Write a protein that binds this DNA or RNA. Structure first.
Lengths: 119, 53, 115, 122, 211
RNA sequence: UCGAUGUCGGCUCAUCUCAUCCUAGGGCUGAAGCAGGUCCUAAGGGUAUGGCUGUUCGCCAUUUAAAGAGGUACGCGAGCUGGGUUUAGAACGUCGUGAGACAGUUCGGUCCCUAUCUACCGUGGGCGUUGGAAAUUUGAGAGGAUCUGCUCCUAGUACGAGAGGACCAGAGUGGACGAACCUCUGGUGUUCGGGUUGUCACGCCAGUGGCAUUGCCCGGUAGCUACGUUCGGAUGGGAUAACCGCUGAAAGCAUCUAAGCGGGAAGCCCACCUCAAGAUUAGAUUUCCCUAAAGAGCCGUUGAAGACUACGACGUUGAUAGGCAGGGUGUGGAAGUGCAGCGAUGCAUGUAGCUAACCUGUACUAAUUGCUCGUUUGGCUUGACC
RNA sequence: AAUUCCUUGUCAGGUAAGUUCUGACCUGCACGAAUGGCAUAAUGAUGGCAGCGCUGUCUCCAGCAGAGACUCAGUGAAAU
RNA sequence: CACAGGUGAUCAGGUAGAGAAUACCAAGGCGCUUGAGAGAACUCUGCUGAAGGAACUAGGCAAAAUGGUACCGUAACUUC
């Protein structure tokens, strides 16, 4: 069973899945629009949006928490310099997922992840 | 572990009576007028009156 | 709090008042005892080694060495059997559960005091 | 939870120091004995020139367990050892001194002297 | 022998003054609105049909909406029937209310619910099969079914042989539970025991058939 | 059956018989009571764990109400094992000049098959059920379940020289078994919190991250779960078995039987739980709708529902999911700064910081009134009504 | 007894209980002195038996992680 | 077979470390030519496990356990 359990597996180890979603969060913070697999896009909200919520308030401790979970100093600077301010008064929902068909190489359902308010 | 007789073509085809290609639901985008998969953006980036590129 | 609001209404009417205490301190629990037809209180004194804070399901386990053999009791906080709790001496500990004290006996089983 | 082939400390002065459970009594497939349950034991190590000798087969009552005993309020009460008290051929204590605490599950009629001789009754 | 439909809200405990914890589960009881009375003349048997809860109109079909409007009751999340008799149908007319006062404190009830669904399960969990040797050369049959029959005679597997399959997600009745407390104003029923299902699931509480 | 039907024993999982081991009902007794013995009825349930030996068995220990006798390819190796027996190595005793041999022993010695069909366990799709639809249902029938100890009391009464010690009634509390459940007690808890070893990195310090089984270690939420909790196995109805009768002739008597009327079992049929109209005999009731309707489905957001399905919820007339907000819980005292200290470190700011899956909310994001299917009053005959 | 059929010989020890083991007896079916006899420190992935520690071996299985199984897309066997 | 096998010699960075063991890195080189989901039974490979601790089994098979350096201490027996 998996009654009430959250999270994903995605055919990876735990540390691989953590690394992949850290990579995906950095890529989304950089480009503001990324094409990915639909299950990955849905799980990406649960890891990318809390970083925006935390960057809503700028402090040394919060920037260090962002860096511990993101490991990208340029993306931490961007997250606390443009995305925190932009989404300051938005109660969540900083990403929008737009389904965009199926991948050629393996027929994976695909989606576009967009930062809300320009991307 | 293996069949004692070859299956007849009739029974082989009765087992395939459930094979069926999936047919996608389609809609017309309000802005562009273009056909698209329902709940999916158009090939050129339009979904529910919103651009993506 | 973690429950349905009706479970909360049933649970909140049964809360009993009690002093605060942390894992690590020495407490005396006054335990109601039915000796037959008579009611008396029996004192269980020892170190709080673990708590679970669950509202009306709150529990705390107290450990003592009584006549050589170690005794743990996992008291239910809001049970009426707990007649009273007094904190005798407060401990300074680095964790919430002192299960490592089950393999300590004398000099090595002693908790630093919190002042 | 005591089962066959469990070592118990001896909590009385009958001369045995360690016993082994060889039967949990009171049921055809009965698995476990808790406090207050009567078991068949062999005594595995006794004190010299005591009442009981090593290799003897006799009755005991479990008086404390490491699994614990439950109380009506939902509390559990655990001990650091598994300990029994040897019994007669009529399941009556053969003890004049009880060592360590016991629980109030021995209240009744046949273990009342165990209760009254214990240094402390939980 | 008419009962009521409630919602399992979860379990807690009730302490007695003597210091005993009673494991209880709480049933949320919205009023059970009588939508239909069945009788020997029109239906051939006697029963009370009730609806409880609420449903939005977009989810209430025209047939069900007409059925509810005939009774004059607001649509609930479901419709349930209770086998009654002449004494049970005494003052229960269409459009009426059944509240938690149908049950008194201390009385025995049976609770029916939908079990928690375990999905597809093997013989070990579904039928308490013994596992086979973890070691000692066992090849790949640790949780295997074992033998399923005999030789040439009978030459088949008998019906009702315990095997893997779906487990849970079935209708289960727990009998002889005690009503710990009743609160009609709060819509609350506190019942000693366990009560099949998960919290949120629909449960049926009826006066006990053993008694 | 030799163009192959794998041996013994164990494990797992059984299924039937009754010549009955326990429990139930009886007659007789060299039946005072308690215990028995024998036979009759009875197959509903139940019917141990170890030591030895490859054992089956058997002996033994300790239990139990009891530790049944059997059939099922001496049930079950395309389910497992492989200890014995039954290949090739080697040795002993023995026999043989020898090669070798031995229901003599001894040490060692490859167990394959992805399941077509029948069967079985689950779960769907189709069509049908005299127009269609949303629900609620009756129950022809099927399955499950069916065990039992001990204590107290009656009563130390009846009975008995004593020793001992009841039936029949009543109350309680267990074992084994089963179900559900997670409040409690615990287990687990690899997207929770800390501590810590080595090394590499983030420019460096500080702070952090990668990797080393989750590096190791200590805790632990939800969920799942038992060893935890709660519940169940009915003391009822009907007809009976053996057995016991009442009245009563055949057969002036007697006689349970021939007519007639009784009693009587864990057994049978109901009662309890679950399933159940493909019960093609396809049942019933309430509503809704018919120049594409009522509805259903696709799709989407999904769920203690789930392999796929199906089932449940919701789709802006919205809390369905995620986020977010406030809580709770867990961890246990963040970072930065300051102070004390030569320093490791300690202390304060402050139970702080962080906190998965939990609780209550909230349209911020995503759930597009899109498309498909599904119609147009439902044949004929007879009868009652009209 | 790597030898003993009868045979689980008998007696002792060990276990609650020991067809195995250890000691002894001698009734050696059918030991015996270079097809060597009886021992023997050390050595052995050698045989038997017994303990301590340790344990999911088991009572009695639970939870969790990964890889398959399951669903989709591509490719596409097998014995019979 | 673009096959988890086999195939002689040579060169031999850092930090720990006795080490050419091991862990993590350098230079250099790779991610091993189906993916995507789901997160049933069952299989495999692991991790944790209340109480008990060999009751398992032919048999402790498997697992669990022990494990370094210095120092102290170390029995029967012995070919010393």
């Amino acid at each position: 069973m998996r009654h009430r359990k959250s999270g994903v597996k995605l055919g990876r180890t735990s540390s691989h899945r953590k690394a992949m979603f850290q990579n995906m969060t950095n890529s989304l913070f950089e480009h503001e629009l990324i094409k990915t697999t639909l299950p990955k896009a849905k799980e990406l909200r649960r890891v990318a949006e809390p970083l925006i919520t935390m960057a809503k308030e700028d402090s040394v401790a919060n920037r260090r928490l962002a860096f511990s979970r993101m490991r990208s100093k340029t993306m931490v600077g961007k997250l606390f310099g443009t995305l925190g301010p932009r989404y300051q008064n938005r109660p969540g929902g900083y990403l929008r997922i737009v389904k965009c068909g199926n991948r050629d190489g393996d027929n994976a359902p695909m989606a576009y992840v967009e930062l809300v308010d320009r991307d | 572990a293996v069949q004692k007789s070859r299956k007849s073509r009739s029974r082989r085809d009765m087992r395939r009576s459930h094979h069926h290609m999936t047919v996608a639901e389609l809609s017309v985008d309000a802005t562009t007028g273009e056909k698209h998969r329902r709940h999916h953006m158009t090939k050129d980036g339009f979904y529910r009156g919103r651009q993506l590129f | 709090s973690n429950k349905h609001l009706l479970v909360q209404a049933v649970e909140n009417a049964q809360i009993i008042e009690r002093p605060s205490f942390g894992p690590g301190d020495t407490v005396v629990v006054q335990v109601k005892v039915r000796e037959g037809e008579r009611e008396r209180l029996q004192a269980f004194e020892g170190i709080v080694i673990a708590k679970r804070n669950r509202g009306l399901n709150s529990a705390f386990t107290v450990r003592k060495i009584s006549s050589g053999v170690g005794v743990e009791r996992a008291f239910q906080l809001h049970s009426p059997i707990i007649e009273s709790i007094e904190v005798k001496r407060r401990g300074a500990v680095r964790r919430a559960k002192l299960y490592y004290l089950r393999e300590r006996s004398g000099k090595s089983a002693r908790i630093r005091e919190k002042l | 939870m005591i089962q066959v082939e469990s070592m118990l400390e001896v909590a009385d002065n009958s001369g045995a120091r360690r016993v082994q459970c060889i039967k949990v009594l009171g049921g055809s497939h009965r698995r476990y004995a808790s406090v207050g349950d009567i078991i068949k034991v062999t005594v595995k190590e006794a004190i010299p020139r005591g009442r009981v000798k090593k290799g003897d087969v006799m009755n005991a009552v479990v008086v404390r367990t490491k699994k614990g005993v439950r109380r009506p309020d939902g509390s559990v009460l655990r001990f650091d050892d598994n300990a029994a008290v040897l019994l007669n051929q009529n399941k009556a204590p053969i003890a004049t001194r009880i060592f360590g605490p016991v629980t109030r599950e021995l209240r009744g009629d046949q273990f009342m002297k165990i209760v009254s001789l214990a240094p402390e009754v939980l | 022998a008419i009962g009521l439909v409630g919602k399992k809200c979860g379990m807690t405990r009730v302490f007695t003054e003597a210091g005993a914890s009673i494991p209880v589960t709480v049933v949320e009881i919205s009023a059970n609105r009588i939508t239909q009375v069945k009788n020997t003349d029109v239906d051939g048997y006697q029963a009370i049909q009730v609806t409880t809860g609420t449903r939005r109109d977009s989810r209430v079909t025209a047939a069900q909406k007409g059925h509810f409007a005939k009774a004059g009751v607001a649509a609930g999340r479901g419709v349930w029937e209770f086998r009654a008799n002449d004494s049970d149908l005494e003052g229960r007319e269409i459009g009426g209310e059944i509240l938690a006062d149908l049950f008194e404190q201390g009385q025995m009830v049976d609770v029916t619910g939908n079990s928690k669904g375990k999905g597809f399960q093997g013989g070990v969990k579904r039928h308490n099969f013994s596992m086979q040797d973890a070691t000692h050369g066992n090849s790949v049959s640790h949780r295997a079914i074992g033998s399923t029959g005999q030789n040439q005679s009978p030459g088949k597997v008998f019906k009702g042989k315990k095997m893997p399959g779906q487990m849970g997600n079935k209708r289960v009745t727990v009998q002889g539970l005690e009503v710990i407390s009743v609160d009609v104003e709060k819509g609350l029923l506190v019942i000693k025991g366990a009560i099949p299902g998960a919290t949120g699931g629909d449960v049926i509480v009826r006066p006990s058939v053993k008694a």
